[PDB]
């Protein structure tokens, strides 16, 4: 079998915690079983299952924090865009489009005109 994420996501926080325990007891048992038996590939699907459950539990807690920090100066560094270290400290579009009172006046009064040769 193997648990599906899209089904995990409908469960409660505490349902997921419990299925995590359930799978852990499962795994423990299987490993006893394994050392009395020529093979045990069933075991693979349950450690994969634990993976997925944790993945899902983690998703939801992150997604929780993410929103209760939405629209704030300052939110934890690991919900901040990764991007690149350079990219991260490049001037913003604002501080970059910045233009001098004097020069904005200039741009307005004498901007590159559209013209054409011919007649």
Partner RNA sequence: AUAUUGGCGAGAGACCGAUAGCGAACAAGUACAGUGAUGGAAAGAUGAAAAGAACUUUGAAAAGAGAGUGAAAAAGUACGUGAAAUUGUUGAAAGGGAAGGGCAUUUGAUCAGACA
Partner RNA sequence: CGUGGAGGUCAGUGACGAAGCCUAGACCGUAAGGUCGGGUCGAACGGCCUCUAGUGCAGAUCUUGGUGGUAGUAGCAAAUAUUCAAAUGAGAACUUUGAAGACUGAAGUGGGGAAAGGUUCCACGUCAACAGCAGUUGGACGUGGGUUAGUCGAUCCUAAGAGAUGGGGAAGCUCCGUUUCAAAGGCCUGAUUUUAUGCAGGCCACCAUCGAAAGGGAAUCCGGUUAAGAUUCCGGAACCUGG
Partner RNA sequence: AAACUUUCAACAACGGAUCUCUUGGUUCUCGCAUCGAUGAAGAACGCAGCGAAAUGCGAUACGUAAUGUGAAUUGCAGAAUUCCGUGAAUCAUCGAAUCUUUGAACGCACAUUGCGCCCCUUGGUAUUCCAGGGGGCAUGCCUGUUUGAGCGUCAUUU
Contact positions vs RNA (CB under 7 A): 1-2, 4-6, 34, 39-44, 47-48, 50-52, 54-56, 58-59, 62, 77-88
Among 15, 18, 33, 61, binds another protein (CB under 8 A): 33
Closer Cβ to another protein, 30 or 57, answer by number:
30
Burial class (CB in 10 A: 0-12, 13-18, 19+), 56: buried
Q: Residues 56, 9: contact at Cβ < 8 Å?
A: yes
Phi/psi of residue 36, nearest 5 degrees: -115, 15
Q: Which of 1, 35, 68, 108 touches another protein (CB under 8 A)?
A: 35
Identify the sign of the CA torsion 67, 70, 72, 73: positive
Give the one entry of another protein, RNA, none that residue 111 binds, where binding means its C-beta sits below a cut-off of 5 to 8 angstroms depending on kind.
none
Summarize as ranges the residues that interact with another protein (CB under 8 A).
28-29, 32-33, 35-36, 81-84, 87
């Amino acid at each position: 079998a193997g648990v599906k994420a899209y089904e995990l996501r409908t469960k409660s926080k505490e349902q997921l915690a419990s299925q995590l325990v359930d799978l852990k007891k499962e795994l423990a048992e299987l490993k006893v079983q394994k050392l009395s038996r020529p093979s045990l590939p069933k075991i693979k699907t349950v450690r994969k299952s634990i993976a997925c459950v944790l993945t899902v539990i983690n998703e939801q807690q992150r997604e929780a924090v993410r929103q209760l920090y939405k629209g704030k100066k300052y939110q934890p560094k690991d919900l901040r865009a990764k991007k690149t270290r350079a990219l991260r400290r490049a001037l913003t579009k604002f501080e970059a489009s910045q233009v001098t009172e004097k020069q904005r006046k200039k741009q307005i009064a004498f901007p590159q005109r559209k013209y054409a040769i011919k007649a």
